[PDB]
Symmetry: D2
Subunit: 257 residues, 4 copies
């Protein structure tokens, strides 16, 4: 038996993402915490869903065609499909757990209707205010926002691999607020969706509905319609993956500080 | 002055050591002649550096990424599978357990390349890496191992190229006796197949792919008769054991493979 | 002389009477104004002749072809569904049970077209044709019917256009009380959805579309509060009954519809 | 309540196809018989899988887009996927039941290997010898042959709706022997397969393997390779649906006689 092998020692231990809840759901004390459980040792450590969860999903040895491009990102669901309690990552609290946003002293919920798709953020991203985006707007100092459009509803704070399909430039309170469009790698049609122009072929009405909702959800809370760069048009996954890297880079610098 | 920028950078600082490798395959020799070889290499995704590797010892048996985000309550079941004999074909290819870096080559009977006389292999047929069915171990019914990697039959609709590797979900196993030794046939399905997610365990195969398991039992039970030999014997009565049993057999196999290297 | 041409023409001579009809829809009026109408017609697939029809009385409740080739042992479950309120929208459209040929029109509150204040309808919402929930019948918990076609909520990923008709598989039912009367909400899924085949009965919805049934119960239970009213009441405790129960309710409904016409 | 409705009386009763077996499987007495069970009345009548089962699948009222073309044909499986006993419709026996073909006095089985796809015929079709096809070959006086390529294996004599995707002109003993390529309307990928050029995108190797098998299965039974019109090329579904109609027409005339 030839044993000639490239002694490529697998370093680190794989980690298992865990979440825990504390506080009373729908009240201001609710929090979803994240932890890593070493898969060899069993040791747990609290981690930050934002800084510590890989933006890029990778395994040790990639067996897919070197010619096939990569498109597997992690996605942190904040507002599950068919719900309206506005939850968010507490970028201010240690270990950035998920908390429900407070509008007054009262926990916030959308007045317009429900979030009809899983809504959240991509970890290890930062849309900086010191950067200027299309139409000359600056970032809103928050992780990049994502909308995963498959049939299955994620639990609050649930994380999973998605395939980026496109992006929408929404202006929010004077700043750039990209909404990345993506789909769970486990959804039945994930494979038939190659780029943003396929969303209407397989989920007719989905993109119009996403556009319309973000365009007007504030109006009924008193506000005004919202503005979009590119004409409320959805840019494709190439443009979207670029914005995400600019984003990952920006996150990298915030951490070097 | 509505700007509250207080961003906590508290994080568990986990350095991601190693560089991700990209599997690559290259061919040499003339297909269907005895010089044909499929060789495997790794390409450091950082440095671009390539090294030749062994599909048998260097491709992980378990597919794993750096941070698992699936429920900790969901048991793991994603193994790597190396295709040797593509679906719908009959040239017997194999991992060269004796040559350096165990490339894939065509099985030679005398000096003539082998092909199945009975018909074509109707499913992708191959092996699971980092496995070893040791002759020094006695299995069910008192048969020893056959000294080769574990055998696997992936049952999805799509056909793999020769030497193609992919993630599969293990569903069950068949204990066939081949020349006095134990020869497990692990039943799996590509994690990319449209029905992979509805196939939970071996008893679901009949529900979604009726005929499939009978046709696997049958082909393996008689494929040697036409070439002159006898039918083949099976443990458990030609029954397919479920994924739990199958995973234990695969664990045993990976353990033995581990010892094999240490010697 | 190897030609043996003896072709038996013995056959049961079943003449296929009627001509297949093609459903057609046409719109009139200005969308979102009270003049908007969606009208249905049939087009004889032979003669090309068109006739206006009623989406309510003329579209078959049961989808059936001339010779069923599915196992006689497999129970039938393919009903027609008329979409009134598309997935992700909020304009309340309805079948005009009072106008001739019952076209679809937008529901008018005073003289103003209606829209749901609470949010959008997140599933295609509509009715099953040839059904009638009679006021002269007392249902579970002693509530009478609401004098309209049965309500249906189709749960697939794809969104229907207003007034679009399609085959759906019935999976269960919810008994909501609406203004003292019984108001069934039949839960179904398009026969074209990728997971239609894995959804056997109402208890499978939670397994493949977790959240879905809770979100349906909730929206229907509170959608009226914001417009000033009260929460809504449910029979069976807001529980979703399975497809068998749901099919019996639909049969009863089709029977009553039959009487309705005879009068 | 407006009751104005187009009184379009539904005539005939729907029929349920039934099959029964007689004789000993794999011996010469095995036969699969067909019957219709009226769905109202319960009355059963023996029918012929060939003359009595609609070539076109139709329901009373078509609710699909009038713009969407029709492509739902019935398919009678004779040789199930992964098997080798050559069964066939007995075009000579009354009510054309399925019987196993007899090569000598011995029931026939393929020597080459198994039929790897469900193999059968389309009902109400006839490939006449008095007609001349591409390359100038005449028909082989039999129903049109079909290969349904989905993942699920049909039982012997099982009938189901398929979507025609293409066709292959195989020459057999001097005559034209079309092999229609199709897929069960229930297979998971049926919807992604639009035409013959999609078969390689979703089932790579399937068309080459189908070509190769029909090209050589006779060689080992002593014979020679087989010839194909069009260069062993698979024509698309438009050409295939045309051949099927010529076929249905021809069947119609055989019956007027």
């Amino acid at each position: 038996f030839s044993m000639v092998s490239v002694d490529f020692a697998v370093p680190y231990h794989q980690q298992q993402l865990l979440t825990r809840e504390t506080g009373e759901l729908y009240t201001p004390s609710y929090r979803v915490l994240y932890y890593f459980r070493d898969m060899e040792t069993g040791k747990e450590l609290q981690v930050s869903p934002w800084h510590d969860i890989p933006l890029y999903v990778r395994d040790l040895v990639r067996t897919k065609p070197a010619s096939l491009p990569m498109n597997r990102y992690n996605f942190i669901c904040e507002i599950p499909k068919w719900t309206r309690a506005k939850f968010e990552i507490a970028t201010g609290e240690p270990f950035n757990p998920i908390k429900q946003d407070i509008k007054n002293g009262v926990p916030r919920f959308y007045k317009h209707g429900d979030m009809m798709w899983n809504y959240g953020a991509l970890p290890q991203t930062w849309e900086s205010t010191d950067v200027v985006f299309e139409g000359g707007y600056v970032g809103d100092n928050d992780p990049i926002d994502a909308i995963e459009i498959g049939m299955t509803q994620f639990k609050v704070g649930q994380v999973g691999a998605v395939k980026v399909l496109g992006i929408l430039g929404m202006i929010d309170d004077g700043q750039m607020d990209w909404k990345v469009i993506c789909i769970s790698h486990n959804d039945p049609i994930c494979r038939f969706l190659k780029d943003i122009h396929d969303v209407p072929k397989f989920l007719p009405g989905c993109l119009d509905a996403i556009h319309e909702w973000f365009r007007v959800y504030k109006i009924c809370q008193g506000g005004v319609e919202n503005k979009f760069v590119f004409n409320g048009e959805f840019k494709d996954k190439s443009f979207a993956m670029k914005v995400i890297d600019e984003s990952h880079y920006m996150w990298g610098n915030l951490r070097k500080i």
